[PDB]
Amino acid sequence: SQAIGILELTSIAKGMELGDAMLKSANVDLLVSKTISPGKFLLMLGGDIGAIQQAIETGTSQAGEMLVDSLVLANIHPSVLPAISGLNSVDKRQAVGIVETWSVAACISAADRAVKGSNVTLVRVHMAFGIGGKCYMVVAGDVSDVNNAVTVASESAGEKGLLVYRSVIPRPHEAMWRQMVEG
Amino acid sequence: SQAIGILELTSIAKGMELGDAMLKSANVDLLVSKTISPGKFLLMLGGDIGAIQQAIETGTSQAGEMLVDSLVLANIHPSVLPAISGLNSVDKRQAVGIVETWSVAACISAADRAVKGSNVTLVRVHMAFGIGGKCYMVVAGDVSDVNNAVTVASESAGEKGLLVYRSVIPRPHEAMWRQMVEG
Amino acid sequence: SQAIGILELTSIAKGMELGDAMLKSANVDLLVSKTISPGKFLLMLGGDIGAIQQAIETGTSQAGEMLVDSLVLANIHPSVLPAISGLNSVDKRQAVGIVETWSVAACISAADRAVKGSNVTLVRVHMAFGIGGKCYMVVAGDVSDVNNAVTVASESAGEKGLLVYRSVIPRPHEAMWRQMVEG
Ligand SMILES: [Cl-]
Ligand SMILES: [Cl-]
Ligand SMILES: [Cl-]
Ligand code: NA
Ligand code: NA
Ligand code: NA
């Protein structure tokens, strides 16, 4: 019911300019606004699909030759948005699931399918290094629920050859727990 | 009326040693002291030109084959120094200006010219990744003042082919403001 | 009397899974658990040698083709462990010593020899960028003690061609001290 918009620029100044322009252009939330090596800039927005399409249209329209890439992912479960900008609260501890993908697009699509095909909580979506790099989702819930979520997410990414690894970790060790659910 | 000294080493231990040596050698402020990938070390100093020349002389004199590069930038407006080490306080909000350059030297020279050719506040000078990488200056003030500052800075960097992008952003959006003026 | 175990994986999810598995497998402390560019994962453990051998055995046994590298360093002075995970308290200020190496293995072995061949405090062991990159140890104590420690450490690393630089810094400047002993 929500949408994610991604805009990547070769200029950090243009990135900040376009972040400003897009936020003014439509009712959208800023999820990510950061510099990526070597010196590119990444913006990710969340909001209604109409708003996101117009925001990304505005951004692409004004990027010129500084435009690197852009994407709109429609019909994304609402919990995915705060999982990109930060952390969702864990309401169950029994198990953690982690699915690692190439690309944040594959990760987002897999996380969406996971949440929609199970009763797990999507805790966070992490990008190790920009939108083309290793990304991973972390889910939490009952072991059976986590297994379902991880399977669905893995199938999503794997169909594309973009699954790196999947892991179901019941009863995570106390010394790993914080890193898993908070980073 | 002030000067900036830059010393880059291939050794982190030598960098810390030379930071110590230079600070003892003259009355200078440490502005930056950090490791840069792959494993080099960056020192930037501020102070009177005489002190900075002797500090950088000392540093270069003792660097040996670990010396990567060194520079002294003379007659730099005093506000540029704290803009490199941290943030200057914003006394006006009406507009933000951002000028992105290749190299911190070009950024410093452009920021100096901007401050000297306008009434803007130089808020900060940011290096994304070491002294040769993308850098940018952020200024704040009245829209007309910011436009002047950005034009002057852009001309400085552009004459060298080192201007990446320039942006005048009146009335920055609330969700971009903090990143612009604080990073 | 203690041991350090190192496990490196090509998968971040596998890394977190293996961190969990190894911690459950034996009585070991997690010293490091982090992602390294481009997208690998690094685990370092401390504990009794028996526990560490079994933990690393477990980790290697389950890593499969995601295994990048693994190492067990036996008979490491106990102070080296907290120097890897964080900071040891400085009980003397007179001098700082810094020895920079290629590889954390060389750094650990050099730090161990330094501590065992002197009365210095090992303050910290730092990895700039993963286990193969620039690393350095920082020691503190009386100038004579620091000189001994640095010489011993330098000989250790230098015999292998893995010494980058060694530095004895009596009476470190106030503006460098915190970075030296805390990072
Ligand atoms: Cl559940
Ligand atoms: Cl102004
Ligand atoms: Cl001592
Ligand atoms: Na649990
Ligand atoms: Na404003
Ligand atoms: Na001292």
UniProtKB/Swiss-Prot annotation, chains A, B, C:
<dbReference type="Pfam" id="PF00936">
    <property type="entry name" value="BMC"/>
</dbReference>
<comment type="pathway">
    <text>Polyol metabolism; 1,2-propanediol degradation.</text>
</comment>
<comment type="similarity">
    <text>Belongs to the bacterial microcompartments protein family.</text>
</comment>
<dbReference type="InterPro" id="IPR011238">
    <property type="entry name" value="Micro_shell_prot_PduT"/>
</dbReference>
<keyword id="KW-0411">Iron-sulfur</keyword>
<keyword id="KW-0813">Transport</keyword>
<dbReference type="GO" id="GO:0046872">
    <property type="term" value="F:metal ion binding"/>
</dbReference>
<comment type="function">
    <text>A minor shell protein of the bacterial microcompartment (BMC) dedicated to 1,2-propanediol (1,2-PD) degradation. The isolated BMC shell component protein ratio for J:A:B':B:K:T:U is approximately 15:10:7:6:1:1:2. Not required for structural integrity of BMCs nor to mitigate propionaldehyde toxicity, may selectively transport specific metabolites. May be involved in electron transport across the BMC shell. Can be engineered to alter permeability of the BMC shell.</text>
</comment>
<dbReference type="InterPro" id="IPR037233">
    <property type="entry name" value="CcmK-like_sf"/>
</dbReference>
<dbReference type="InterPro" id="IPR000249">
    <property type="entry name" value="BMC_dom"/>
</dbReference>
<keyword id="KW-1283">Bacterial microcompartment</keyword>
<comment type="subunit">
    <text>Homotrimerizes to form a pseudohexamer; in wild-type the central triangular pore is probably blocked by the [4Fe-4S] center. Interacts with PduS.</text>
</comment>
<protein>
    <recommendedName>
        <fullName>Bacterial microcompartment shell protein PduT</fullName>
    </recommendedName>
</protein>
<feature type="binding site">
    <location>
        <position position="37"/>
    </location>
    <ligand>
        <name>[4Fe-4S] cluster</name>
    </ligand>
</feature>
<feature type="domain" description="BMC 2">
    <location>
        <begin position="95"/>
        <end position="181"/>
    </location>
</feature>
<dbReference type="GO" id="GO:0051539">
    <property type="term" value="F:4 iron, 4 sulfur cluster binding"/>
</dbReference>
<keyword id="KW-0004">4Fe-4S</keyword>
<dbReference type="InterPro" id="IPR050575">
    <property type="entry name" value="BMC_shell"/>
</dbReference>
<feature type="domain" description="BMC 1">
    <location>
        <begin position="3"/>
        <end position="85"/>
    </location>
</feature>
<dbReference type="GO" id="GO:0031472">
    <property type="term" value="C:propanediol degradation polyhedral organelle"/>
</dbReference>
<dbReference type="GO" id="GO:0051144">
    <property type="term" value="P:propanediol catabolic process"/>
</dbReference>
<comment type="function">
    <text>The 1,2-PD-specific bacterial microcompartment (BMC) concentrates low levels of 1,2-PD catabolic enzymes, concentrates volatile reaction intermediates thus enhancing pathway flux and keeps the level of toxic, mutagenic propionaldehyde low.</text>
</comment>
<keyword id="KW-0479">Metal-binding</keyword>
<dbReference type="InterPro" id="IPR044872">
    <property type="entry name" value="CcmK/CsoS1_BMC"/>
</dbReference>
<keyword id="KW-0408">Iron</keyword>
